[model samples]
Target: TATLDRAAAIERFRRDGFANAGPVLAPDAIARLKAGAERLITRFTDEGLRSDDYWNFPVEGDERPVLYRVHNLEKQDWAPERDLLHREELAQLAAAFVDGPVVPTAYALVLKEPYRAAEVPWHRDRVNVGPRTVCNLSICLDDAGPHNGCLEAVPGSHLLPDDAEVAKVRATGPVVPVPVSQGDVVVHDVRLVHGSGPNANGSWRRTIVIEYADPAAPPAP
Candidate 1:
């Protein structure tokens, strides 16, 4: 079923601060997504990062710099596929978890290679959006294993009292590796303190991550 097995998935999400669910796409779908991303990378290089105006900035001298790709579904012309993967039922389920509207934010394609060993740094994503209403969706496009780099999180860390409390939870909590295959999806709260390790393997780590924010939240001034 496209919908998660609610009782099991929700409980796991609550306990782990994240959930890994599937209806993982067939091989053909995975192929299409990879092709689509390669195409975008080529197009952006030829066209020059698309535009200068954006919502975020890169940390100075970060080797693995993260570039924002806005209106990704529309840009990749994958709205139909995006809608299919991110169904309303899933959104509603997430809303129940975070208690917010959950509008789609940006869709990001994170590419990490052996040489790009800059760590993403351990931090929670509590920017202007705040913690109460933000979430992240990570869809794996490659086999994410220990060597190739994988997401690690502190279980139930989302419930910590403050940012410092959350950081403390991350400091003391176990760092569990989340490995997924192509087409697999994982979801987590924005406040969940998490980050990736170095990609020591020669292979590249590629994944698409989409962030969602509550529609009812106040807009940027």
Candidate 2:
């Protein structure tokens, strides 16, 4: 795996509101995390269990709703996920961006299944907060591209005022696709306007997202 250039990554994050942090996880780690995720999804479907952790949405003609996301992995102590999300590498990365002690505020697994996947609407996360105090790290579990609904965001959009009108017009700016391979991590400012389209390809696009924030910083207003 390629190592991340911490200095360059920091620069990109400050300039573009997001940056690809390069490869973070090894193959073994990825396999373990993927296995656990698969088991959880199977349990959710086969056992017919429901919880606040699962985010499902209806597909027009399909009777079964699509499982778009699974949240709060840290709280649930989900296996392999716990180890990967809390790794020292991620903690160091979070510390670099935050410049202070950080903690995992939340976590989720985005399951963008082929064909049946739904589009993620453009939106900013954690509005009205200090920019560097919080960020989200998304680790790709599979190859991602425009064909598979890879992330797209406007560069420098995080610097804009947190207003409805400003967010609405952001679409006029350049929306760049963030293509990432397996094990690659993409870090984005919490206020960055970003989203993705549905996966039109035959492969699955999964990403493990961990939200890290400076514990001392006041909550978003």
Candidate 3:
């Protein structure tokens, strides 16, 4: 874990539109969170229960199920959310990035199954929220490297004027792979043009993502 000054973090975030929050969880905590995810996998599949939290990015003819992610863990006060996302470490950073108190808007566990898998195409997460304001966190549960489909991003793509412009930058993406260790977290602006290639290293690439927003915008009723 690296100690960073709050002021330094904010400046870095605004400049690059992404900031590394170092290791926000300890070994024991990481273990607990990993167990939580494993438990859900068993609970969902073993019990044959339908959960909106389960998602599959199917590779249709490839024999693999398409479930790529699971969202809204905060509802259950679970690992990928309550325990991990609500921690002061993240909250402090989120507030700095948004320049206001922030709250979780969306959260998910992203699983890129081992071996045969489809590549995550380069795209900004802005389609779902205000690109400039939303901050997306990437917490790794296992060692992520280039060979294992580590994240790739255009460092400051978040500065672009619009999605079309973001797309243009993506095509020539200076896409750098962000390799991370277990417990390491990478926070990127929602507008960052990023994606990943397949994991051919025969290991799972699991990451928990939380999209936090300033509480200023509320749902229209």
Candidate 4:
């Protein structure tokens, strides 16, 4: 994997509302994270757990509840998940953009299960609103692309107002599909308009999405 130029990446993120930071995670780190995520999923499946942390939805023609995402992985106190929350490299990357101290707002795992074809609608992450350098750094656990639910974002859409017409923007805007490999980190502005398609392929696509923000930023509603 190539090393990302810090200055250029910082500049590009602000200008484009998103930037691919190349591959940041080490080989071992990627393996560990993938293992940890699978362990959690296995536990959820075996125990039939029901909780707010586990976001589940039904799939067409499927009887079992499909796990869409899991939020607040830091609270689990697991090694791989917790280690990423305190990773200095990640904090430094976010701090560079915010130009100040940064605190992790939250972290979640988005699991696009095989054969489920889950779709996320076009929307912005609703929190830490405004241009205070709040962003989401997503670490890919598997190779992601249009075949497996890669993110499709509208560039420069972060500057648009909250009430901006999404339908028109989605129809004619400069939407780009972000393809990332395992161990790569993709950062996006919190207010960026983005969505992803269904994972119709057999591969399982997973991402660890960690939100970071300037400490002075207002708390999410």
- Give each prediction's root-mean-square deviation over alpha carbons: 5.2, 2.3, 3.5, 2.2
**Which lDDT tens digits does candidate 1 get at residues 62-122?**
3324433334553454444544445565466557656667777666677664444445667
| Candidate 3 deviant stretches above 4 angstroms | 1-10, 43-50, 59-66, 76-84, 127-132, 218-221
Give the C-alpha lDDT of model 2. Answer: 0.80
Candidate 3 TM-score, true structure as reference: 0.81
Count the clashes in each prediction: 0, 0, 8, 0
How does each model score on TM-score?
0.71, 0.90, 0.81, 0.90
Question: Model 1: which residue pairs collide?
Answer: none
Q: Model 3, residue 116: displacement in angstroms?
A: 2.5
lDDT agreement with native, every candidate: 0.64, 0.80, 0.72, 0.81
Which candidate's lDDT is highest? 4
Model 2 clash pairs are: none
76-195, model 3: which lDDT tens digit per residue?
535453465567767666776668787777878887677765678887777445555778878788888887888888877777766456567877767788878898778888777888
Per-residue lDDT of model 2, residues 1-221, tens digit only: 76659788888898888988887767788777777777767666677767889889876674677788888876654665567777778867777865777887888888887678888988888776867778988988888998798998988888777674545646587889999988888999988888889987788888889888888766656
Model 2 regions more than 4 Å off: 1-4, 164-167
Q: What is the lDDT, from 0 to 100, of the residue 59 in candidate 4?
A: 50
Question: How would the candidate models be sorted by lDDT, starting from the highest?
Answer: 4, 2, 3, 1
TM-score of 2: 0.90
